[PDB]
């Protein structure tokens, strides 16, 4: 999901949290 990712990236969180949410 290109859009689900671009959302996670836009969020204000630590890189670990983005990585956590994008892998999961």
């Amino acid at each position, epitope marked *: *999901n*290109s*859009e689900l*990712l*671009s959302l*996670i*990236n*836009d969020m204000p969180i*630590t*890189n*670990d949290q*983005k*990585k*956590l949410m*994008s*892998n999961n």
Partner: antibody
Framework: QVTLRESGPALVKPTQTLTLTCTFS??????????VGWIRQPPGKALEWLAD???????HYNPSLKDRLTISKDTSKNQVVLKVTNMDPADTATYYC????????????WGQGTTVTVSS | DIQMTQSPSTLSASVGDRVTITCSAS?????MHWYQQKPGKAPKLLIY???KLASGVPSRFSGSGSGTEFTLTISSLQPDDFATYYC?????????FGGGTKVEIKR
């Protein structure tokens, strides 16, 4: 296989601007999650991260080399460009580009690097 | 920002020896990553996600750690392992590498 090739001047006078280009293949930067970062290695020193950029045009820079850095992309030509202003002999180093993903914030594939010397 | 202290800075060991390299970060980190570099070559990814083996990397290598303390371990050291090893964090900006560890092989 994903490949990356850096290119730019080998020699550059002090105060002059360095313009590096990373041409890659095997993947597209317009793909979600994809990123390209620049990393350099001064003679007899450890690796130093410089900058990166993402498919959504988000950019990051290393505060040490600020505000001398400018990073941009062109997905059409599959390339990323890094500019370093006001070059100093201490900026002499080997410069690398490398792929990155948000699934994994590390550089899995690297270019072979190109060497830049700052001298009169 | 997050700095990385790596030890030992240098090392010499015989083929077959167990070798352990340590990286200690100034602040807490989610994952530690490791890079092997040969002379005049570009760094190759050895270990990612703290303990995961990158592709084409002998199970001889292994990773372990959490918080601010991580270690890389080469079970039975071999000739082709001569290199400089760097840890890498991407958990926060700027990205940073460790000072590096230089591995020489006693023969």
């Amino acid at each position: 296989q994903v490949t990356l090739r850096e290119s730019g001047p080998a020699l550059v006078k002090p105060t002059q601007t360095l313009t590096l280009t990373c041409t890659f293949s095997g993947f597209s930067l317009s793909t979600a999650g994809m990123s390209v970062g620049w990393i350099r290695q001064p003679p007899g020193k450890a690796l130093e991260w410089l900058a990166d950029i993402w498919w959504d045009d988000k950019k990051h820079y290393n505060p040490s080399l600020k505000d001398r850095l400018t990073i941009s992309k062109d997905t059409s030509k599959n390339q990323v460009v890094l500019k370093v202003t006001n070059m100093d002999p201490a900026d002499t180093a080997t410069y690398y580009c490398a792929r990155d993903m948000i699934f994994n914030f590390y550089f899995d594939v690297w270019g072979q690097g190109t060497t830049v010397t700052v001298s009169s | 920002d997050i700095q990385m202290t790596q030890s030992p800075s240098t090392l010499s060991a015989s083929v077959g020896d167990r070798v352990t390299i340590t990286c200690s970060a100034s602040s807490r980190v989610g994952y530690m990553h490791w890079y092997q570099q040969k002379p005049g070559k570009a760094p190759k990814l050895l270990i990612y996600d703290t303990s995961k083996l990158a592709s084409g990397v002998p199970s001889r290598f292994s990773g372990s750690g959490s918080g601010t303390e991580f270690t890389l371990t080469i079970s039975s050291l071999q000739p082709d392992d001569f290199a400089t090893y760097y840890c890498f964090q991407g958990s926060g900006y700027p990205f940073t590498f460790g000072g590096g560890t230089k591995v020489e092989i006693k023969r």
